[PDB]
Amino acid sequence: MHLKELLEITDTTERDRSLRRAFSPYTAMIDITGSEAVALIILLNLTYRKNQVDDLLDKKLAKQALKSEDHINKCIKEIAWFHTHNLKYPDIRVSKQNLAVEPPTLHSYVLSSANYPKAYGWSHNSAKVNFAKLFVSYFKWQNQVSWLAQVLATNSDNWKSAFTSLGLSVKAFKSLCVTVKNSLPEEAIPDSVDRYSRQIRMPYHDGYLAVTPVISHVVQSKIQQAAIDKRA
RNA sequence: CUGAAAAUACAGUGGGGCCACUAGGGACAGGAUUGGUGACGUGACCUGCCGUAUAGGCAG
């Protein structure tokens, strides 16, 4: 349930495997209300490759990434490509588009993203797939589902200690906080329909409407985590 | 006016060599199947002749 309930394992391989499984979107969200510093170390160590990291609780190469403002810049470049609906599924040829919208109207008889709170996935460019993991990985705060950008947007004072515990400056931290809060995912609707996006004709007021179906990250992530639990 | 239109997976190929299922062996005792029953008559196959002939051939 809690972060350091899984840190009790003396074997680092089993620990890091369980931690990497815990912070992946195909499993349940772990509570980090007690553990904010250690949470930041592992979340910022997830930004590296698997074969580049021996242990996720190594503090120094986390500070190597954090002190390097060519590393965190890439992680805040990847926030603009945070979707509620994946346009690159299953065809990846849908070129440089991002759909971020509120869930639709709730219906009693059908299931959609309206039946869950608004969560975000990422889809831009495979080269930066690790750089998203810092700011898109979902965790449990106090008693509330949250990700790093949303929890650093308003409630920064709770994370000041956790961020300054490594030796980050106040100037850099507050400039990082305002640029992250300014670079939060807006209501992104593409200006043009892509060549590889599937369109259909549905009967509208006195004619037809062009409809592009896009999957929701939330319903997919729920079906994935339901499938790993072997429930259906 | 369909998760919309459109779409050639292909070419080549050595599983081979060797081999002991064996020894032993009681299915056994007893047994009431029994009572009662109409194949035809709405049908064709008849009536005669030849022939020594219930042989064999013939006419309506």
Can you spell out the DSSP letters for A18-45?
A: HHHHHTSTTSPPPB-SS-SHHHHHHHHH
Contacts of A110 (CB under 8 A, 6+ apart): none
Is there a contact between A40 and A167 (Cβ–Cβ < 8 Å)?
no
Beta strand pairing call for A121-122 and A85-86: unpaired
Task: Locate breaks in chain A with C to N over 2.5 A; list the residue preceding each.
Answer: none
**CB neighbours (10 Å) of residue A152?**
20
Query: Does the C-beta of A116 come within 7 A of strand B?
Result: no
* A1, containing H or E segment: none
Q: Is the CB of A219 under 7 A from strand B?
A: no
Residue reference for tokens 């947007």: A153
| Residue A196 phi, psi (nearest 5) | -100, -5
- Which DSSP category does A91 fall into? -
Task: Name the nucleotide with the smallest C1'–CA separation from A90.
Answer: B3
Of A53, A5, A175, A49, which is closest to residue A163 (Cα–Cα)?
A175
Considering only the C-alpha atoms of chain A, give the largest distance between any 2 of them, rounded to a whole number of Å.
68
- Please, which residues have CB within 8 angstroms of residue A171's CB and are 6 or more apart in sequence? none
Is residue A87 a contact partner of residue A98, using CB atoms and an 8 Å limit?
yes
Is the shortest CB-to-strand distance from A213 to strand B under 7 Å?
yes
Determine if strand B comes within 7 Å of the CB of A138.
no
Cα-only R_g, chain A: 19
Q: Which residues pair with residue A2 across a beta bridge? A: A31
How remote is the C-alpha of A105 from its chain's centroid?
24
The type of residue at A52 is Q
